Each structure stands twice: as structure tokens, then as C-alpha cells.
Design a protein around this ligand. Structure first.
Ligand SMILES: CC1=C(CC(=O)O)c2cc(F)ccc2/C1=C\c1ccc([S@@](C)=O)cc1
Length: 90
């Protein structure tokens, strides 16, 4: 079940979701949500929970990107201004 959530970065300063990259023999393990930090934008939503997979983040797609690279691009968005839309795979 793919769900897209729009986090408000006006009142929230951090998302509160530690990204965990899944590493294996191949490498396309993808990035998943580790833990949610109370006080973050994600904790204000509720649809995202530990174990959710990040697919698309503000138009950008991480499904065919490296785990590390996904976080690289993600950091550019997370350290920017504007609404952050997270597309998770539950
Ligand atoms: C909690 C958390 C957030 C969201 C937030 O709380 O605002 C986040 C955003 C990013 F763009 C990158 C990393 C993180 C993070 C925890 C963590 C995950 C991976 C790394 S390594 C893969 O660089 C380090 C730390």
C-alpha cells in the first residue's frame, strides 16, 4: 500500500525519521524508516511507521537509486525550504 504524505516544514524543523539503508549481496535493498522521533513532522502525521519504505520524495525517485545516494539527495531536500512529500510503501 503506497501512501503519499505531505509534511509541513513551516511549523516543523525536522522530520523525525532515521533512514535505514538495506544492504545485501546485490545492493538494491532500498531505504526504510527506522524510528520516528517525537516532535518531528512525521510524528505529526501518523501514516508513516517504522518499517515503511521510501520510494518517491518530492518528485525524486529513490527506487532505482543507491541507498547512500538516496540519503544524499534526501538530505538536499530535508535541508531545504518547502513542503516535503514522502511516498512510502507499506
Ligand atoms: C532522523 C533522520 C532524518 C530526518 C529528520 O529527523 O529530520 C534524516 C534525513 C536525511 F536526509 C538523512 C538522514 C536522516 C536521519 C537519520 C540518519 C539516517 C541516515 C544517516 S547516514 C545514511 O548518512 C544518518 C542519520
Amino acid at each position: 500500500n503506497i501512501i503519499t504524505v505531505t509534511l509541513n516544514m513551516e511549523r516543523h524543523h525536522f522530520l523525525g525519521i532515521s533512514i535505514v539503508g538495506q544492504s545485501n549481496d546485490r545492493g538494491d535493498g532500498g531505504i526504510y524508516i527506522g524510528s520516528i522521533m517525537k516532535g518531528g513532522a512525521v510524528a505529526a502525521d501518523g501514516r508513516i511507521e517504522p518499517g515503511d519504505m521510501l520510494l518517491q520524495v518530492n518528485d525524486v525517485n529513490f527506487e532505482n537509486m543507491s541507498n547512500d545516494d538516496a540519503v544524499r539527495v534526501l538530505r538536499e531536500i530535508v535541508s531545504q525550504t518547502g513542503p516535503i512529500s514522502l511516498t512510502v510503501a507499506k
